[PDB]
From Swiss-Prot, chain D:
Transmembrane annotation, as ranges: 10-30, 175-194
Intervals, Extracellular compartment: 31-174
Positions annotated as glycosylated: N122
Protein's recorded name: Glutamate receptor ionotropic, kainate 2
Species annotation: Rattus norvegicus (Rat)
Full-length numbering of the shown residues: 630 to 839 of 908
Length: 48, 97, 149, 194
């Protein structure tokens, strides 16, 4: 998923800087931790 | 036989192969031996650790090593009649009899 | 990103990624004798000997009827012991294989340090492990740097 | 006679359920014995905190664990940090007797373990090599002998004398408990009428 910036805008360059900023800081890792988070209901636990 | 020296072999009293101090940064034994040149050589089995190699020089290795797990063989399992009739109690066996 | 920041690229004509190859465990043996695995040839030969002995016993019983019932009951409970032991052994290693959880994730490979793992030296895989910020691939990078050669 | 039919049906019923219960008990016991893994390798002892493990105290073994980044080796490092006064011993023989007497594992030189298992039948080597290093001869910094020592080590390796010198110097179970009972049953089956 991305942002539909206008053509020639500096928002594309800001997003290009922000890509390396989030990759060097690992923002997708804490994004996976925070918002793709089990707020209850974990995976299929086999009960015997 | 290779280099041709009159080698003298004697004992140390430091009791360790060499370890830097945790708060003083001071070594002991073979490392402080070869810092101060008290003796020219220390023929002992010593691993090429980079902490020791950054202090004193190390030779190229001649044999490999590896940390391995040491354990025993505690295996019994006597093949008898009692092991055959194990999973039911003998009081239940004589009550069925 | 290092190659792109050094020199220009074209459009990627296809999109791909890094995954894991493992040898498929072919621990299954031919179905013939597979159900004989719980059985024991040696104890099989011993049971053959026992049947031969029961036959000789019946023979002398007439060439040496409560005794026939005693011999038949002893042989019958002996075969029931054989059947119960074989069924117990067969269900035992049947439950050995089906209780096993094989490798299905990269995190399982990160935990399992017995099975060795790595890639091609001076490739994009070790570059991605250098630039890995997720701790799982960081532990992957620490493992492959530990077994450096 | 329906009484004989009732007695035979009840007898077949309880004999079959006793046989089924004995088969179920033996299957559960054998499945537990198979599930009890006796392998105590590096991935096994990472979480097995019941079995004690460690090395010779303040040696090069936990020095490798001082800078270890693998989470299994980090678990070993945290366990020896938790129980530093107990599982760490000053000499090799103290850890050897700790392995022989108590439920203990010892992490030390593989050549020493090979020599001990050559000279003692009561010990085993499990797992493989945790690290991979070599024996370097201790020299001073900038030593003029060390260049000649390196040349002599290369010459002795190409001669192969160190390898052959190290070659000379410091190098039915439960089924078996079944057919004895079957042979005893054969003995009792012979002693009936013949
Ligand atoms: C299989 C492979 C090996 C690379 C080896 C190194 C020594 C190199 O040739 O730089 C290549 C295939 N093409 C990839 C690339 O160079 O982009 C690389 C695979 C990889 O980098 O993981
Ligand atoms: C058994 C041994 C050393 C004995 C005691 C330790 C506490 C030490 O003084 O290093 C040697 C064997 N070779 C290893 C080495 O290359 O230094 C070392 C093993 C170790 O230090 O744990």
């Amino acid at each position: 998923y991305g942002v539909g910036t206008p053509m020639g805008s500096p928002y594309r360059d800001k997003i290009t800087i922000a890509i390396l900023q989030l990759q060097e800081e690992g923002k997708l890792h804490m994004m996976k931790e925070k918002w793709w988070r089990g707020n209850g209901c974990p995976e299929e636990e086999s009960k015997e | 036989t290779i280099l041709g020296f009159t080698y003298e072999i004697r004992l140390v009293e430091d009791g360790k192969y060499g370890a830097q101090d945790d708060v003083n940064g001071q070594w002991n034994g073979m490392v402080r031996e070869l810092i101060d040149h008290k003796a020219d050589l220390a023929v002992a089995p010593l691993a090429i650790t980079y902490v020791r190699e950054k202090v004193i020089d190390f030779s190229k290795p001649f044999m490999t090593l590896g940390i391995s797990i040491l354990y025993r063989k505690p295996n019994g399992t006597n093949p008898g009649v009692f092991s055959f009739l194990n999973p039911l109690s003998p009081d239940i066996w004589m009550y069925v009899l | 990103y290092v190659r792109e920041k050094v020199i220009d690229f074209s459009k990627p004509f296809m999109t791909l990624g890094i995954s894991i190859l493992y040898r498929k465990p072919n621990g299954t043996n031919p179905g013939v004798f597979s159900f004989l695995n719980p059985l024991s040839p040696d104890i099989w030969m011993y049971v053959l000997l026992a049947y031969l002995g029961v036959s000789v016993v019946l023979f002398v019983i007439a060439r040496f009827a409560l005794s026939t019932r005693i011999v038949g009951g002893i042989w019958w409970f002996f075969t029931l012991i054989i059947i119960s032991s074989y069924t117990a052994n067969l269900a035992a290693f049947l439950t050995v294989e089906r209780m096993e959880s094989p490798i299905d994730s990269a995190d399982d490979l990160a935990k399992q340090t017995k099975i060795e793992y790595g890639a091609v030296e001076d490739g994009a895989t070790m570059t991605f492990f250098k630039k890995s910020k997720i701790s799982t691939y960081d532990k992957m990078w620490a493992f492959m740097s530990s077994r450096r050669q | 006679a329906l009484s004989t039919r009732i007695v035979g049906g009840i007898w077949w019923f309880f004999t079959l359920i006793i046989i089924s219960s004995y088969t179920a008990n033996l299957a559960a016991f054998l499945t537990v014995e198979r599930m009890e893994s006796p392998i105590d390798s590096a991935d096994d002892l990472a979480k097995q905190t019941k079995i004690e493990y460690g090395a010779v105290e303040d040696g090069a073994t936990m020095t490798f664990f001082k800078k270890s980044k693998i989470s299994t080796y980090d678990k070993m490092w945290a366990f020896m940090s938790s129980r530093r006064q107990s599982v760490l011993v000053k000499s090799n023989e103290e850890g050897i007797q700790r392995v022989l007497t108590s439920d203990y594992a010892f992490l030390m030189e593989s050549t020493t373990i090979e020599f001990v298992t050559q000279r003692n039948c009561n010990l085993t080597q499990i797992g493989g090599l945790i690290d991979s290093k070599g024996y370097g001869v201790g020299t001073p910094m900038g030593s003029p002998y060390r260049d000649k020592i390196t040349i002599a080590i290369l010459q002795l390796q190409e001669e192969g004398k160190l390898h052959m010198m190290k070659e000379k110097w410091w190098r039915v179970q439960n089924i078996g408990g079944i057919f004895i009972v079957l042979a005893a049953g054969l003995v009792l089956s012979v002693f009936v009428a013949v």
